[PDB]
Amino acid sequence: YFKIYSKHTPIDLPQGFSALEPLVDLPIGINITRFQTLLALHRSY
Amino acid sequence: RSYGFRPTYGVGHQPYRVVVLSFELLHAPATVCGPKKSTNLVKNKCVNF
Numbered sequence: 492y493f494k495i496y497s498k499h500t501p502i503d504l505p506q507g508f509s510a511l512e513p514l515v516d517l518p519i520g521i522n523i524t525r526f527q528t529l530l531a532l533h534r535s536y
Numbered sequence: 537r538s539y540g541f542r543p544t545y546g547v548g549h550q551p552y553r554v555v556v557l558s559f560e561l562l563h564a565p566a567t568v569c570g571p572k573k574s575t576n577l578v579k580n581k582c583v584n585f
Contacts, residue, residue, distance in 0.1 A: 518567065
């Protein structure tokens with residue numbers, strides 16, 4: 492059963508308080524053991 | 537081989553379209569659930585919701 496959350500705020504992590512909210516609906520059987528970040532650039536590789 | 541489908545054929549040799557719906561119930565969570573509903577927003581009276 493999937494899980495992902497997000498929240499956006501106008502400020503590093505400050506000393507304030509805010510809560511993350513569940514964002515999608517994705518129930519799929521995976522032994523998820525991977526994580527990859529995808530950036531963006533203009534050098535066009 | 538190929539079929540000689542023609543209008544002059546009888547009822548046993550004419551083209552018949554056949555579909556088969558096979559249901560799968562793997563351990564995976566179910567994602568295709570049939571419909572349901574009724575319609576009363578009854579107030580000022582205790583009912584079963």
